[PDB]
Structure 1
């Protein structure tokens, strides 16, 4: 199944974090990277007392169960020093969010797929569109069309 993973970093040298993350994503068992986006510098969503993010997206082919992929993504966050601050939407050395897991709809305590907020975020949608311009969401919506509708500002390269 192709999983689409959003990468965000705004602490501790985001370019280094993102490169380290991509290496580690490629090392997850029973999986391999298909396509990587460009790297974009994006203003924070949420609290404004934090640095700009590097955002990217990756398409990962995997035979893992979605929760076992999440175990592996969370382990890479840990490996890279991610600390979950008290405040919502605060800074991170690395944030790996599962945007899509093929065409699956997943709603569990640990895991909500498609990512609950992705359709509201150009920092997630633009890098996804770069790597999967023909994507169709589980609900039948085209990514290309969501982008049109929302008219989100285009992103700046890192």
Structure 2
């Protein structure tokens, strides 16, 4: 199965967290990375007093079940999603979301795939389009179609 994972980090300087996360994704059992999008810089959807997000997309070939993959992404968030500050550990700044899991539709207590809001988010769609321009969603919607319809602005690279 090709799973598409969105990476987001809103650390002030996120490159080292993002790289640590990418390495960890490549260590997930029964899986391997196929391709990684560019890193993109995207404003937060609120006050400008917050750090930019770094957003990227990863194609991961996996034989894991969707919930097993989620266990691993959540583990990675726990293990390398927080950065040590001067006095204490900081809060979670790394987000690993499963955008698509092959052509599967998943609606459980733990999982909603396709990701419930990705079609509203240029910061999810654009990196995905870079690595999968011909992508078709389970219901037959095309990624190209969603971007064409909504006209979301292209993202600046990090």
TM normalised by structure 1 equals 0.91
Distance in 2 between the 1:149 and 1:128 partners?
Answer: 16
Q: How many residues align?
A: 158
Q: Highest Rg: 1 or 2? A: 2
Write out aligned runs for 1:10-29 (5 A): 10-11=10-11, 13-29=13-29
CA gap 1:91/1:48 in 2 versus in 1, 3 angstroms? farther
Post-superposition Cα deviations, 1:16-35, rounded to whole Å, max 9, x if no partner, equal 11111110000000000001
Post-superposition Cα deviations, 1:73-117, rounded to whole Å, max 9, x if no partner, equal 011111113499999999842100000000000001110000000
Is the 2:40–2:155 Cα contact (8 Å) retained in structure 1? yes
Is the 1:104–1:113 Cα contact (8 Å) retained in structure 2? yes
Q: More strand per residue: 1 or 2? A: 2
Deviation at 1:144, TM superposition (A): 0.6
Post-superposition Cα deviations, 1:29-78, rounded to whole Å, max 9, x if no partner, equal 00000010000000012465421100000000000010110000011111
* Structure 2: gaps spanning 5 or more residues: none
TM normalised by structure 2 equals 0.91
Distance in 1 between the 2:46 and 2:111 partners?
Answer: 22
CA gap 1:83/1:67 in 2 versus in 1, 3 angstroms? farther
RMSD in angstroms over aligned alpha carbons?
4.0
